[PDB]
Amino acid sequence: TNSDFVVIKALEDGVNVIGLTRGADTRFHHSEKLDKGEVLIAQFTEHTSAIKVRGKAYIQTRHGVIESEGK
Amino acid sequence: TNSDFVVIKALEDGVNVIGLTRGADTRFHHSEKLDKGEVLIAQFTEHTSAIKVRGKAYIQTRHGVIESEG
Amino acid sequence: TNSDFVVIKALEDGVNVIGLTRGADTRFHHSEKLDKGEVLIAQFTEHTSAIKVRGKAYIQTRHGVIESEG
Amino acid sequence: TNSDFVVIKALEDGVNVIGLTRGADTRFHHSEKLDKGEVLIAQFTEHTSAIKVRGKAYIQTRHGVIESEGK
Amino acid sequence: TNSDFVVIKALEDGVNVIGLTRGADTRFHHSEKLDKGEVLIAQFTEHTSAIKVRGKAYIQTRHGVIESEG
Amino acid sequence: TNSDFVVIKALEDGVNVIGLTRGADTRFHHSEKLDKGEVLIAQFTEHTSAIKVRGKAYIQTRHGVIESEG
Amino acid sequence: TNSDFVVIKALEDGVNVIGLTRGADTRFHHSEKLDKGEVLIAQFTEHTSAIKVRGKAYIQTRHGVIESEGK
Amino acid sequence: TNSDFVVIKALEDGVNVIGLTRGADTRFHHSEKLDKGEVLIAQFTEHTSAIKVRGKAYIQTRHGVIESEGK
Amino acid sequence: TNSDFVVIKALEDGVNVIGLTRGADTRFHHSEKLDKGEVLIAQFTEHTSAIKVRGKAYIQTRHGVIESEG
Amino acid sequence: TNSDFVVIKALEDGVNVIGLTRGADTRFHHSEKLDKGEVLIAQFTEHTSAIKVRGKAYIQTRHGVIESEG
Amino acid sequence: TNSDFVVIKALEDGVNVIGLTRGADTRFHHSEKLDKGEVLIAQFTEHTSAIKVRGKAYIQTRHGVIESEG
Numbered sequence: 001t002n003s004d005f006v007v008i009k010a011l012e013d014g015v016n017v018i019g020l021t022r023g024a025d026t027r028f029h030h031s032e033k034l035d036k037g038e039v040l041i042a043q044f045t046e047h048t049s050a051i052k053v054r055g056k057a058y059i060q061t062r063h064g065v066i067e068s069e070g071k
Numbered sequence: 072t073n074s075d076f077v078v079i080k081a082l083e084d085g086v087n088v089i090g091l092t093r094g095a096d097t098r099f100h101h102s103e104k105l106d107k108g109e110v111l112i113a114q115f116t117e118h119t120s121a122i123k124v125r126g127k128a129y130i131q132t133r134h135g136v137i138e139s140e141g
Numbered sequence: 142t143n144s145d146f147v148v149i150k151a152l153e154d155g156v157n158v159i160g161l162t163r164g165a166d167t168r169f170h171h172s173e174k175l176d177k178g179e180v181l182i183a184q185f186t187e188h189t190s191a192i193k194v195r196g197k198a199y200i201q202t203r204h205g206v207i208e209s210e211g
Numbered sequence: 212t213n214s215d216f217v218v219i220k221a222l223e224d225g226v227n228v229i230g231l232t233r234g235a236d237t238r239f240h241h242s243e244k245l246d247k248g249e250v251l252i253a254q255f256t257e258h259t260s261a262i263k264v265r266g267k268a269y270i271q272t273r274h275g276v277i278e279s280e281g282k
Numbered sequence: 283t284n285s286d287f288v289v290i291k292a293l294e295d296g297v298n299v300i301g302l303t304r305g306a307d308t309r310f311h312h313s314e315k316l317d318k319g320e321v322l323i324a325q326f327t328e329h330t331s332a333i334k335v336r337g338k339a340y341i342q343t344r345h346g347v348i349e350s351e352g
Numbered sequence: 353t354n355s356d357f358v359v360i361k362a363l364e365d366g367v368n369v370i371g372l373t374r375g376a377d378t379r380f381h382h383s384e385k386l387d388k389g390e391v392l393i394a395q396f397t398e399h400t401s402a403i404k405v406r407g408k409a410y411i412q413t414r415h416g417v418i419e420s421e422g
Numbered sequence: 423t424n425s426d427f428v429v430i431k432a433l434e435d436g437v438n439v440i441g442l443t444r445g446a447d448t449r450f451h452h453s454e455k456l457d458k459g460e461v462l463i464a465q466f467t468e469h470t471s472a473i474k475v476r477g478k479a480y481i482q483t484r485h486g487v488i489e490s491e492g493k
Numbered sequence: 494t495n496s497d498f499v500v501i502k503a504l505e506d507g508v509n510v511i512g513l514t515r516g517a518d519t520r521f522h523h524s525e526k527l528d529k530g531e532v533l534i535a536q537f538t539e540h541t542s543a544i545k546v547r548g549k550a551y552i553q554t555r556h557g558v559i560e561s562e563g564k
Numbered sequence: 565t566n567s568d569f570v571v572i573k574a575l576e577d578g579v580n581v582i583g584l585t586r587g588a589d590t591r592f593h594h595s596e597k598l599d600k601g602e603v604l605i606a607q608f609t610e611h612t613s614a615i616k617v618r619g620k621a622y623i624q625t626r627h628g629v630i631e632s633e634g
Numbered sequence: 635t636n637s638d639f640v641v642i643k644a645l646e647d648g649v650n651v652i653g654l655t656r657g658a659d660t661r662f663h664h665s666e667k668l669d670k671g672e673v674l675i676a677q678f679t680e681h682t683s684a685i686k687v688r689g690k691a692y693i694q695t696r697h698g699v700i701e702s703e704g
Numbered sequence: 705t706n707s708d709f710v711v712i713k714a715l716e717d718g719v720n721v722i723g724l725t726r727g728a729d730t731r732f733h734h735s736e737k738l739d740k741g742e743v744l745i746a747q748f749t750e751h752t753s754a755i756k757v758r759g760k761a762y763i764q765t766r767h768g769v770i771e772s773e774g
């Protein structure tokens with residue numbers, strides 16, 4: 001429960017924050033839908049070892065700021 | 072007990088800090104409502120591995136400041 | 142017992158620092174009342190995984206200064 | 212025996228540094244009274260997970276300086 | 283679990299982020315296709331000890347920024 | 353044996369550096385008397401979880417410099 | 423799964439990133455070919471305790487930037 | 494055996510570095526005399542949880558420089 | 565498996581990076597030959613507790629840059 | 635095998651670097667003589683919990699530079 | 705296997721890097737001869753708790769640079 005985390009702010013409606021399964025197999029286990037202006041703060045966990053952001057978002061990680069772009 | 076935490080200051084009444092379940096499943100287990108000017112300082116835990124904020128709020132984490140908008 | 146802590150200085154009477162329970166269940170277990178000018182320094186612990194401040198206060202955490210407003 | 216500590220310097224007589232119990236219960240377990248100019252350097256411990264300061268004092272923690280103020 | 287991670291932002295369609303198997307044997311176990319403007323934040327794990335990026339992408343690691351070329 | 357320590361330099365004769373007992377009970381277990389110009393470097397330990405300085409002294413900790421007054 | 427990693431960007435076709443075996447024995451166990459513009463981010467592991475880069479590449483480690491030169 | 498240490502440089506003959514016992518009891522267990530210009534680098538240990546310097550000395554610790562003054 | 569590492573870049577042909585055995589005995593167990601412009605990133609390990617560089621090379625460690633000379 | 639270390643450079647012949655025993659008992663167990671210009675890099679260990687330098691020497695520790703004088 | 709290491713570059717022929725035994729006993733167990741311009745990167749280990757450099761050499765440690773004079 002001490003893992004890194006990412007901060008995602010949706011810059012439009014319908015931004016998808018997608019968790020990919022930890023392990024030998026890689027698939028999406030969850031998509032969190034964010035509407036404009038909502039903020040999600042999400043850890044890497046026993047179940048999530050990779051995170052995909054789809055749509056326009058402002059993203060902060062330990063390595064700095066990055067922005068996803070929609071459509 | 073040592074884990075990261077988030078600071079959320081409500082900038083309007085009814086800000087909703089939403090704790091999502093750690094584990095194979097993902098659903099909210101708790102929603103803490105804040106009135107304007109109230110501050111919540113909240114850890115990631117055995118039970119919460121993601122936090123969502125709805126409503127207008129000033130948020131600080133280890134990565135800096137971010138603001139949610141309602 | 143080296144987890145993080147928050148410093149709260151009441152800027153008016155009747156400030157409440159509230160501890161939220163760690164675990165599957167989330168409820169308030171203690172509200173500490175601070176009057177004007179008193180300072181509480183409070184850890185995250187086995188029993189407290191989130192802290193709510195109600196009323197006007199100057200707060201310090203590892204992420205910097207925030208102020209709760211009455 | 213590795214915890215954070217607080218430094219408290221009394222700026223008037225009768226400063227109370229109060230230890231609150233670690234655990235499911237929260238209660239006062241000790242009040243240390245300081246005369247003006249005395250310095251207490253106090254850790255968080257197995258028994259103390261929250262500290263209250265009453266009266267005028269100069270306080271240092273890892274988060275910087277704060278001052279308590281008296282009635 | 284507390285591992286390092288890599289941030290990849292596709293600057294064109296069809297970018298591939300490829301995980302290479304941890305262990306005595308080295309082969310591809312997964313490729314994640316990213317379209318333009320999508321962001322992947324991927325850890326090293328029990329199963330992935332090297333990551334290859336093919337196509338035009340903006341990459342952030344602990345060592346700074348690097349860019350792959352299409 | 354890796355706990356924090358405090359540096360106390362007595363600025364007058366008769367300075368007392370007092371160790372308070374770790375545990376459920378809080379009481380003075382030792383008072384080290386310092387004369388003008390002597391330096392005591394003292395750890396927090398299994399037996400000492402709080403230190404009180406009485407008398408005029410220049411004090412250094414991890415949080416910086418502070419001075420006790422006569 | 424905590425080790426350091428190396429970032430390799432190929433500046434020409436046919437760059438080889440080569441892993442040397444951990445243990446009493448030292449030999450190449452894998453050579454990953456990178457074409458121009460591809461980026462490999464590769465950890466030290468239970469099986470790799472040394473990494474050789476051959477060909478023209480831009481390399482980042484904790485210690486800073488370095489460039490391999492081909493031919 | 495990775496604890497803090499203090500550096501003590503005698504600025505006159507007869508500087509006395511005094512090690513105080515770890516434990517419920519507190520008394521000195523060792524006194525190490527230094528002549529002018531001699532340097533002692535001394536750790537906190539299983540047996541020493543506090544160190545007292547008598548006499549004129551230049552002292553460095555993690556918290557910076559401090560000087561003891563003689564009598 | 566997270567020890568320190570050295571970065572060696574050969575500035576001429578025939579540079580040798582030589583691993584010395586960990587343990588009570590000290591002998592060379594491997595010499596890696598680097599030709600001009602090749603880079604070797606080599607850890608200290610269970611088997612290697614000292615590394616010797618013979619020949620002209622640019623070297624980076626945690627303590628900074630050093631150059632061996634042929 | 636991971637402790638702090640001290641660097642000592644002899645500025646004259648006959649510099650002594652003396653190890654004091656770790657434990658309840660304190661005594662010199664080794665004295666390493668350094669001639670002018672020689673450098674000794676010496677850890678704290680299971681057997682050495684204090685180090686004395688006698689003679690003119692340039693010394694480096696984590697806390698910076700200090701000089702012993704003959 | 706993550707002790708500190710020292711970097712030694714010989715500035716003349718015949719530089720000796722001597723390892724001193726860890727333990728209650730202190731003696732030289734190995735001396736590594738370095739010719740001019742050769743570089744040795746040597747760790748502190750289970751068997752080596754002090755390192756002596758004889759001859760003219762440029763040295764880097766975590767505490768910065770020092771030169772032995774030969």
Ligand SMILES: N[C@@H](Cc1c[nH]c2ccccc12)C(=O)O
Nearest residue numbers: 019045047048093094096097120
């Ligand atoms: N139940 C999920 C919640 C989660 C955390 N981080 C995520 C990132 C994306 C999607 C879901 C999540 C988990 O513990 O892993």
Ligand SMILES: N[C@@H](Cc1c[nH]c2ccccc12)C(=O)O
Nearest residue numbers: 090116118119163164166167190
């Ligand atoms: N009982 C919850 C309290 C909590 C901590 N962080 C939160 C964030 C959001 C909502 C609830 C919480 C827990 O230990 O997980």
Ligand SMILES: N[C@@H](Cc1c[nH]c2ccccc12)C(=O)O
Nearest residue numbers: 160186188189232233234236260
């Ligand atoms: N008994 C409580 C004391 C406490 C610590 N931090 C708090 C924050 C708010 C309220 C009470 C507390 C506990 O150990 O958790």
Ligand SMILES: N[C@@H](Cc1c[nH]c2ccccc12)C(=O)O
Nearest residue numbers: 022023025026049301327329330
């Ligand atoms: N199931 C994969 C998911 C993953 C994490 N990082 C990756 C990098 C590339 C490809 C897949 C991944 C794993 O845990 O290892």
Ligand SMILES: N[C@@H](Cc1c[nH]c2ccccc12)C(=O)O
Nearest residue numbers: 304305307308441464467469470
């Ligand atoms: N299977 C290899 C993958 C690898 C990691 N780093 C490398 C560097 C070079 C070559 C292969 C690798 C391993 O776990 O070690």
Ligand SMILES: N[C@@H](Cc1c[nH]c2ccccc12)C(=O)O
Nearest residue numbers: 230256258259374375377378401
């Ligand atoms: N016996 C108390 C001493 C103490 C430490 N920090 C304190 C803060 C306030 C009051 C008492 C204390 C304890 O070990 O917990």
Ligand SMILES: N[C@@H](Cc1c[nH]c2ccccc12)C(=O)O
Nearest residue numbers: 512535538540541656657660683
């Ligand atoms: N035998 C003593 C040596 C010592 C270390 N630090 C000291 C400070 C003062 C006096 C003696 C010492 C010990 O291990 O504790």
Ligand SMILES: N[C@@H](Cc1c[nH]c2ccccc12)C(=O)O
Nearest residue numbers: 371394397399400515516518542
């Ligand atoms: N015997 C005491 C020595 C001590 C360390 N720090 C102190 C501070 C004050 C008084 C005594 C001490 C102990 O180990 O705890």
Ligand SMILES: N[C@@H](Cc1c[nH]c2ccccc12)C(=O)O
Nearest residue numbers: 444445447448471583609611612
């Ligand atoms: N098999 C060797 C490989 C190696 C790592 N670092 C080295 C430095 C020099 C020579 C060989 C090596 C080992 O694990 O130790």
Ligand SMILES: N[C@@H](Cc1c[nH]c2ccccc12)C(=O)O
Nearest residue numbers: 586587589590613723749751752
């Ligand atoms: N076999 C020696 C190699 C060594 C490491 N560091 C040294 C310093 C000097 C001489 C030899 C060494 C050891 O593991 O300890």
Ligand SMILES: N[C@@H](Cc1c[nH]c2ccccc12)C(=O)O
Nearest residue numbers: 653676679681682726727729730
């Ligand atoms: N055999 C000694 C070698 C040593 C290390 N540091 C020292 C300092 C002084 C004298 C000897 C030493 C030991 O392991 O402790």
